[PDB]
């Protein structure tokens, strides 16, 4: 495949590994989740644009809209977690062990 | 009568919202009543974005012009006089 697909696929993997290798801040994982979406948007746009598949041109927008609404829900849960323990650390979310 | 005294109250207390609802109401209703709405579809149709690929003449196409300036084919005389 083309060169760009190498780096775009790599960026998705890097953000996936970042997401699966949590640290402390819940916000840091939400950023890796949004990084995955960014690379998905770029990968889909490149494919759709290069192939001249015209009706699919709206698809990256729909992906952006739903993902952002999905990110809004994630931020709402982060603030509720932060209102409970005073931080967004993920090690506080262990009551259900 | 009951509705008339309702409108007077909102107009006095919430004129901004009364205007909003009225403007939005006109936007949903007027296109169905306007006599010019049909020309919007006609003009959009008449705009030639792509090439008009000619047909192969089989001898049974009396309604297809042989030349752009021939009297057959869609006309835009209605649009010029619009």
């Amino acid at each position: 495949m083309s060169m760009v697909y190498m780096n775009i696929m790599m960026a998705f993997t890097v953000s996936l590994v970042g997401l699966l290798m949590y640290r402390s801040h819940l916000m840091s994982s939400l950023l890796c989740l949004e990084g995955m979406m960014l690379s998905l948007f770029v990968m889909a746009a490149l494919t759709i644009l290069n192939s001249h598949f015209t009706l699919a041109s709206m698809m990256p927008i729909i992906l952006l809209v739903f993902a952002a609404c999905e990110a809004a829900l994630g931020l709402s849960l982060l603030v509720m977690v932060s209102n409970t323990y005073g931080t967004d650390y993920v090690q506080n979310l262990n009551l259900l062990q | 009568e009951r509705v008339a005294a309702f409108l007077k109250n909102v107009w006095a207390k919430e004129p901004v919202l009364v205007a909003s609802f009225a403007i939005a109401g006109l936007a949903v209703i007027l296109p169905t009543l306007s006599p010019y709405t049909k020309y919007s579809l006609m003009i959009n149709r008449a705009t030639p974005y792509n090439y008009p690929v000619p047909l192969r003449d089989d001898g049974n196409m009396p309604d297809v012009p042989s030349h752009p300036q021939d009297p057959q084919g869609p006309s835009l005389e209605w649009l010029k006089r619009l």
Partner: protein
Amino acid sequence: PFFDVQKRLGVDLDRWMTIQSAEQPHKIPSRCHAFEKEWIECAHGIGSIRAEKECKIEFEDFRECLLRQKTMKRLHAIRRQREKLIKEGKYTPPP
């Protein structure tokens, strides 16, 4: 679909975007329209088990148009042989 409501009700909810050879705004074609068109018509109505073997030629051509992996491999081969020959002074590009 798991429940084919669209076919049964005769309503097009999302089939219009499924393939690139479907109707497009202003008849804009996709770059691989003819290849997808040929592969779809070969494989129509015979099932994926049969299609994977009997329409293999069309799918191989279609995949070549999509990703151009063979074409790039051939150009990369001619490019290798030139910038090699140019070093041995055995080739002179035209004006």
